[PDB]
Write a protein that binds this ligand. Structure first.
Ligand SMILES: [Mg+2]
Ligand SMILES: [Mg+2]
Ligand SMILES: [Mg+2]
Ligand SMILES: [Mg+2]
Ligand SMILES: [Mg+2]
Ligand SMILES: [Mg+2]
Ligand SMILES: [Mg+2]
Ligand SMILES: [Mg+2]
Ligand SMILES: [Mg+2]
Ligand SMILES: [Mg+2]
Ligand SMILES: [Mg+2]
Ligand SMILES: [Mg+2]
Ligand SMILES: [Mg+2]
Ligand SMILES: [Mg+2]
Ligand SMILES: [Mg+2]
Ligand SMILES: [Mg+2]
Ligand SMILES: [Mg+2]
Ligand SMILES: [Mg+2]
Ligand SMILES: [Mg+2]
Ligand SMILES: [Mg+2]
Ligand SMILES: [Mg+2]
Ligand SMILES: [Mg+2]
Ligand SMILES: [Mg+2]
Ligand SMILES: [Mg+2]
Ligand SMILES: [Mg+2]
Ligand SMILES: [Mg+2]
Ligand SMILES: [Mg+2]
Ligand SMILES: [Mg+2]
Ligand SMILES: [Mg+2]
Ligand SMILES: [Mg+2]
Ligand SMILES: [Mg+2]
Ligand SMILES: [Mg+2]
Ligand SMILES: [Mg+2]
Ligand SMILES: [Mg+2]
Ligand SMILES: [Mg+2]
Ligand SMILES: [Mg+2]
Ligand SMILES: [Mg+2]
Ligand SMILES: [Mg+2]
Ligand SMILES: [Mg+2]
Ligand SMILES: [Mg+2]
Ligand SMILES: [Mg+2]
Ligand SMILES: [Mg+2]
Ligand SMILES: [Mg+2]
Ligand SMILES: [Mg+2]
Ligand SMILES: [Mg+2]
Ligand SMILES: [Mg+2]
Ligand SMILES: [Mg+2]
Ligand SMILES: [Mg+2]
Ligand SMILES: [Mg+2]
Ligand SMILES: [Mg+2]
Ligand SMILES: [Zn+2]
Lengths: 97, 72, 225, 33
RNA sequence: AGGAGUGGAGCCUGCGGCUUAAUUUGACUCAACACGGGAAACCUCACCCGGCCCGGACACGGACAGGAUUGACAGAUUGAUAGCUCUUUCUCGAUUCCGUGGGUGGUGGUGCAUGGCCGUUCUUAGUUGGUGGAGCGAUUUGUCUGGUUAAUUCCGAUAACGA
RNA sequence: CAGCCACCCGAGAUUGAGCAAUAACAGGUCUGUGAUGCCCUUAGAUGUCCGGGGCUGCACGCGCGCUACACUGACUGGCUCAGCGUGUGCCUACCCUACGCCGGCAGGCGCGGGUAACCCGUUGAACCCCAUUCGUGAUGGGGAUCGGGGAUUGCAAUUAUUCCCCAUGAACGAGGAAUUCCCAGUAAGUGCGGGUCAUAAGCUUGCGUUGAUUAAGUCCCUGCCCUUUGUACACACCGCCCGU
């Protein structure tokens, strides 16, 4: 799907920071609630997560109206190589606090 | 019920095909033997379109393609 | 502002229903039994009851640490108000949901319908239930659908005691040629404590105590102490 | 893995096309021959 | 035995027909017909007329920073301020675009392939083992001559006992 | 004996619903579902938006209903009594209304309360009651169909959304063959809430108020259960089967 590169950067940064993603399955929602002040439509998030799922990077669940996505190890490696993050950075999920 | 086809309309509405232009950067500047550069295309007065965003030299108007600003 | 009590209770019920549905879909494989939400002004605790907690927790606690994240993402209440705990069920044989899931996953593995149903029935009866019923409906063999019924022990159908003496579970399983339906009913035994059964007895069961032995009096005796 | 149950096969297909087969299977389960 | 009625009138609403470009469709004795919670100006919408969009993931091949592609002012055009198309040039920077597979989305077809739910037989009083008795056997008794009850409810009789 | 009838005492000597077995139906639902198996279609789409129409179109038949055919009535005043419930909403825009002023009315302006035994609200409901006018005349019964104006909801009211005012004033004088429901606070009369709802009840689901005639039986009609009995039926009388 066609979208500006900064939207993809923001979505991937949020996904790697948190480790999980939630969406409402609303292609007409003007902007994702979590991605505020960055002007990312919900449709872009849905399609980006679908593209990630097709490659095995994220695991998907659907509940009552919502998409839930969890990050896989190969997805972690792909995001780390994509965002040029140092090997000392891990998502908040992988930290047993 | 089964879907009927009924496939008959205007023969084919064609999609717009964008023109392929080779080295469109060159025609924006003119060069003298001394090495001077003169900008043939006007520069938009907008904020973002200030230095490298040139306008369009239409036969009766000037048009910036990045912000739709139009001048006579 | 604030909402009225009617809307508040309806919203709490809807939230619990959606949470239970999500947990079911997520943890069916782990023998998910139920969810219990205890609301405290400090934090809202969620207890997840399942047959095995090792898969729910995950390695080093990753998977559960994911769930308490997405829940916080879904319903939107602030961080630090979420904390999930996994507790194993006291007896897995007396839970209709766990047995329905076990039967569903035995069928999904290719086991014979009759053998799996009889194994589940035997396990339920050995657990200590008064009785059990298992019904499997669908295209078991051929283009024509049918239903197999396996019953054992006692079973009540009508009245109010059905509410607290019978545990019911309905499940669907997708096989290569379509959907099969599973229904499981378990009749709980009477337990004076509320651990593994109803505290109150059946309405029509009357227990008359045996009288104690009494010494026949013969001569008037006066005892002073 | 437990794949086939002769008892269920006979009890279901005793009146179907495959009766004469399943009966023949059931005896093999019973008499050991 | 009666009361209020309906069937007659006007009107409101569903179902057939007949018209229509379309007058979307399910259901037809109880157990279809102010029923689908179906009181539709738009949406709903599934029907008809006309016009945009891809929201065609992913893999392989081609093309590509000497530019893959994106959007758009004016005039024409259009129901339309859909750059939808035509003239004109501008803008965008690898996100896409062309082929092969392979997916997705459907109020599309099958309820005579299914699950679940609901309705009906029937809310009537019915149903079934275990040991015993009778038959080579299928099968039968228990579950009955009779009184009683809303009731296989009970009392009684009793090769049946308890359930 | 099981139990039945009557009576005393007594608030009550049968309150009304919910749940409801074994077995089945080719009963309804794929148009409730991100329940679902197979087919069909997928860029000139059966996907999805936008604009305009249709679902309501009228020589005719069939159901569920509302209003009536009047005097045990209609109209105009006066007086006086309820209950069940709802109310400011994640997306989500849309709540219930007291009081003051303007208008003849539908309505319009202000300014307050209520997230509710707190405010609307002592929910001044309608039938009913007391007076006035009319007087067996399709009549001051009935209110269909139409004309001209005004106002609210909406982005949009024409094929009239709804509401208000003048005017117009149809059939209908109790209904053939046939047919439905009902045994006490019941049937019927009369209003009021909830659902649908931007606009909104002739439907449904509940609630009160006024309040009866008849019956305490039967198997005649209809239907469903048992027992005995006959069968060449077992896809079970919508069967099987004979002869031209
Ligand atoms: Mg019982
Ligand atoms: Mg009962
Ligand atoms: Mg009437
Ligand atoms: Mg009549
Ligand atoms: Mg009539
Ligand atoms: Mg009809
Ligand atoms: Mg249709
Ligand atoms: Mg009936
Ligand atoms: Mg209809
Ligand atoms: Mg309407
Ligand atoms: Mg219109
Ligand atoms: Mg439109
Ligand atoms: Mg329409
Ligand atoms: Mg594209
Ligand atoms: Mg469609
Ligand atoms: Mg669908
Ligand atoms: Mg069916
Ligand atoms: Mg079915
Ligand atoms: Mg059923
Ligand atoms: Mg016996
Ligand atoms: Mg015997
Ligand atoms: Mg014998
Ligand atoms: Mg018998
Ligand atoms: Mg009897
Ligand atoms: Mg059928
Ligand atoms: Mg269904
Ligand atoms: Mg479907
Ligand atoms: Mg289907
Ligand atoms: Mg429908
Ligand atoms: Mg349009
Ligand atoms: Mg439309
Ligand atoms: Mg209609
Ligand atoms: Mg009806
Ligand atoms: Mg009527
Ligand atoms: Mg009515
Ligand atoms: Mg009067
Ligand atoms: Mg009058
Ligand atoms: Mg008067
Ligand atoms: Mg009066
Ligand atoms: Mg007159
Ligand atoms: Mg008159
Ligand atoms: Mg007018
Ligand atoms: Mg029309
Ligand atoms: Mg008038
Ligand atoms: Mg009402
Ligand atoms: Mg209303
Ligand atoms: Mg209706
Ligand atoms: Mg009779
Ligand atoms: Mg004879
Ligand atoms: Mg016989
Ligand atoms: Zn500019």
């Amino acid at each position: 799907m066609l979208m500006p590169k900064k939207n993809r950067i923001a979505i991937y940064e949020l996904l790697f920071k948190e480790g999980v993603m939630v969406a409402k399955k609303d292609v007409h929602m003007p902007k994702h609630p979590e991605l505020a002040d960055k002007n990312v439509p919900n449709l872009h998030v849905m399609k980006a997560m679908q593209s990630l799922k097709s490659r095995g990077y994220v695991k998907e669940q659907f509940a009552w109206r919502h998409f839930y996505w969890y990050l896989t190890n190969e997805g972690i490696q792909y995001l780390r190589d994509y965002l040029h993050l140092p090997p000392e950075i891990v998502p908040a999920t992988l930290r047993r606090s | 019920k089964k879907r009927k086809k009924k496939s008959c309309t205007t023969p084919k509405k064609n999609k717009h095909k964008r023109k392929k232009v080779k080295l469109a950067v060159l025609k924006y500047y003119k060069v003298d033997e001394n090495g001077k550069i003169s900008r043939l295309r006007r520069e938009c007065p907008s904020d973002e379109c200030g230095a490298g965003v040139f306008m369009a030299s239409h036969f009766d108007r000037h048009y910036c393609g990045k912000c739709c600003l139009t001048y006579c | 502002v604030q909402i009225s009590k009617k809307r508040k209770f309806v919203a709490d019920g809807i939230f619990k229903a959606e949470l239970n549905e999500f947990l079911t879909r997520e943890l069916a494989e782990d023998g998910y039994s139920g969810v219990e939400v205890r609301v405290t002004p400090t934090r809202t605790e969620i207890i997840i009851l399942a047959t095995r907690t090792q898969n729910v927790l995950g390695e080093k606690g990753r998977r559960i640490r994911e769930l308490t994240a997405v829940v916080q993402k879904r319903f939107g209440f602030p961080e630090g108000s979420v904390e999930l705990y996994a507790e194993k069920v006291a007896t897995r044989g007396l839970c209709a949901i766990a047995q329905a899931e076990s039967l569903r996953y035995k069928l999904l593995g290719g086991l014979a319908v009759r053998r799996a149903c009889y194994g589940v029935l035997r396990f339920i009866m050995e657990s200590g239930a008064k009785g059990c019923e298992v019904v499997v409906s669908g295209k078991l063999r051929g283009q024509r659908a049918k239903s197999m019924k396996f019953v054992d022990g006692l079973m009540i159908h009508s009245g109010d005691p059905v509410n607290y003496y019978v545990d019911t579970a309905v499940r669907h399983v997708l096989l290569r040629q379509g959907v099969l339906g599973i229904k499981v009913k378990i009749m709980l035994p009477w337990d004076p404590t509320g651990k593994i059964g109803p505290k109150k007895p059946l309405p029509d069961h009357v227990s008359i105590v045996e009288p104690k032995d009494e010494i026949l009096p013969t001569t008037p005796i006066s005892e002073q102490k | 893995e437990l794949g086939t149950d002769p008892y269920e096969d006979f009890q279901e297909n005793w009146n179907t096309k495959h009766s004469s087969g399943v009966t023949r299977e059931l005896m093999r389960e019973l008499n050991g021959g």
